[model samples]
Target: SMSYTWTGALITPCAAEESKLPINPLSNSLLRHHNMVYATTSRSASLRQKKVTFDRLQVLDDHYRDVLKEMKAKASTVKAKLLSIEEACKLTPPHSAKSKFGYGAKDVRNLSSRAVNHIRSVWEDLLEDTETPIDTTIMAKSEVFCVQPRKPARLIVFPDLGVRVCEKMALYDVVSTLPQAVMGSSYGFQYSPKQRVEFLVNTWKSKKCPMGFSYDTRCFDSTVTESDIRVEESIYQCCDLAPEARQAIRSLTERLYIGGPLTNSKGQNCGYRRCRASGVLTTSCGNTLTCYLKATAACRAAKLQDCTMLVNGDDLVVICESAGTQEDAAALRAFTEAMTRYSAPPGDPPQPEYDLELITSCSSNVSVAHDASGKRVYYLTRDPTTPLARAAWETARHTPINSWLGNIIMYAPTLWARMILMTHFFSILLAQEQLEKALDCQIYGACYSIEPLDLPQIIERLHGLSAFTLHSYSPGEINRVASCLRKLGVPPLRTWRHRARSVRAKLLSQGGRAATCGRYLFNWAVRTKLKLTPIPAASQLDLSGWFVAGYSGGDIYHS
Candidate 1:
């Protein structure tokens, strides 16, 4: 038969008036026995028995929700501040300086300074005036803020009409070879020689090749079948406009324009009046009208491109390629006409216009080459040169801005602002959640402990063991110890006290110094004979012989 044993029993409720009797007699007896057994166990087993398990413990669910809500609100507020700062920066002028060589250097430092100051003001307001305060103490102690004292708003400027240059001969060779390659290979459709050549030329020209060269003879050691095939040496140049121009291009690429109704110095709507007026532009008038017109035009142009338009405090440039021909002249006129028509419409959007042109003339194509006699000779042309004429012809055939406006809408400030708002809002919410956790730790201590330890001491100890501290314990080890203590419901202050006492006891006992009254009692019970023998020195009695035993025989061992 198997025997069953009850390890413990629950205490029964006692009468209120029974002062002399044990409180919960059944529980008291059981507890007494359990405690005695526990106390007599090995140190490790005692510790294991005392350890408290808290698998179901947690910070209050309501508190977590409240924290998340607060954080979301904070994020939204911060995002608004960020937008305001951005607006202020937009209102200010960018940093720029004119140079002696006619090339001006951009003052990025000044721009950054102005933008940062604006952002800083917003940051300060968010920190001081906001309903909720970010617990910056943690950030301060971690030195995260010190690492980046001033976080400037990032400003990226896209330039208009940036140029990339390449050789014309290469362009021509690619054009010529493309058709033959396409046809000879079974991978694609074949074309007639003329069609192939024309297709190649158009493809090459569309790619914006900068310059070209002609090769009359083969440089490689190969048997030449025919000399009629002239290789056109080509170079392509991608001409990028200035920074301002690139920005304008990017803006125009994304959208047509950004801004409100045109206003006069009196702050009245002058959209209609401005259309019929001309004047010596004053600074104030220029600011009002130019800004309005530029923005309006950009917006209208953006509509055409199906893109959003944004206005930045930067210069604008327009690039037009012209071949100096009647056809190009006609095309330029038509292009200008389209812009004019778009700008004059009722309820038209604001935008900026620029007069710019790049011209190539026939007199610029002269070069030296070897004749049939192997003598070097200069080749000159008087009639419309092919390269110059081609450029002029293309300018004439250029498409209007309205036709391509829809392709450039992604760079709008409104879109960027929206994205920033969403991102920052979520971040704020997350921070709030963490802050709530910190607050809970402050208020309730850890979840398991009814009587929590001092938060400051725990925090201090954590800091002492962090990467910045000199203590040898690694972060992992510290965390493990802390987690175990938390699970055991051990107050942090108590743990700290225990550790201190242990260290002191170790130091005193290891050095062979008197430890405590208990140590004295232990020494007395064992007597001095149990202690390690002291080494004999010169002029000291040799006590080693006193411990020897005598044998049963007459011979005596050292006693």
Candidate 2:
């Protein structure tokens, strides 16, 4: 039977002890990990936090002010507006909470003028009632699960209609464009996992880092104490804003940025969450900038250094001079101290190890390979839970998991992604006659409703010339992937390779755009060659501003 899977943060890694923790029945079929999926944030937070203190504070200086100035200048060029009721409703994700107002999500989706008018009033309320901060609805998410199942689900807190639309108008544009200008490469989503791996590998080979490790923050979103807001404001203030930008920034900070009273589905107050809210415009930008600031100061205090400090939100990885083993441990203590003082507590705390693979961040572990031409390739991966959960979902509603499509799109050239994710999802879509259907999906949490035909450009942009060129998965990659599938009771590599043959043949048989998609997206294991062609006349993609957003985070954010 297929199961549905859909798809953050903070806190310590859990123990791998096995037993009932309220998982779905098939949970036993999967191997479990004590480490959270993405094992995000500080890893050993609970254990190491007793030694940490929060009295230390961050002071504004030239570097931070300079970063803010650049971000503001970038913000000035973006053209933003009040969303026509239609435009505002269009931004809502499918399966997002239905309207508390009498109109339904489907009504909004179908462009009912009534839904449009209602939401328009909501947006107006947000603008006019600036003093009354909009309250976001909080809901626990269960759709996005990992194969290595965690016992509990995470919560996503988002504003009700008017504020959500207002957020798009005022702050979304600012956050999407400003982070890269402010933090440069440290902008979390700005680079692909492949590029990140490349950076780590090249840096490690330079010999400056004999050892390195990743540090995770506990409840990274919750860790943002009230004091952090002042610094965030200072950064925003540095920007040369056009009056309203300052007001919008201030409003966001007071209401959404620091979060507000939490209301459950039943409309009861569940108390308030004091830190940054998980579902908001500033979530990504706030995390990246705030995290980098503290890491920089901590590195200065610890005296371990680097040109490259890789971070995507609170999950950070840096390889610098390893203090002597004894001294490095001391350095780690100081680094942890610096971070705690800044407010992000250790979940999977810090360590100094020489090997990049040994240090996981963003729940991704690094592995190496050489493409057909032999240039070393590195890509990020975790366990296969996400794909496996998604694979199981077909039995329920028969809707294929677009998340699988997205993960494979970004990591297409990687071994498991190429072999399993691509093979499985394509096989599923082919049966549903959806090989060409462009459904709504997310990449790095941004939305896009695209078919396989639209992906070659994205794959090219992420992995470069290697998209259609790489023919083989390196031995090391093949071995690790093979082991995971076997352990998880999924089909073996040969099974995927065989499935590819039929899927490849199906695409070639379908003709036109289908054949083109088959050639570009699923051609790796085909026995005979198929010609790769240009984009079809009608399968168009327009992700202009989205492309800029994608450039900032790592993957291309298209809609």
Instruction: Judging by lDDT against the true structure, name the best candidate.
Output: 2
- Across residues 361-445, which tens digit of lDDT does each residue of candidate 1 receive? 1111122223223453322212211211121122223211111111001110111111221122122323343212211101100
Q: Best-fitting candidate, measured by TM-score?
A: 2
Score each candidate by Cα lDDT: 0.21, 0.60
lDDT of 2 by residue, 338-429 (tens): 77766666886676776777777777778665554667666676666556555444322334336666677766767777777676667667
How does model 1 score by TM-score? 0.14
**Consecutive 10-residue window with the lowest summed lDDT within model 2:** 1-10
| 10 residues in a row with least lDDT, candidate 1 | 136-145
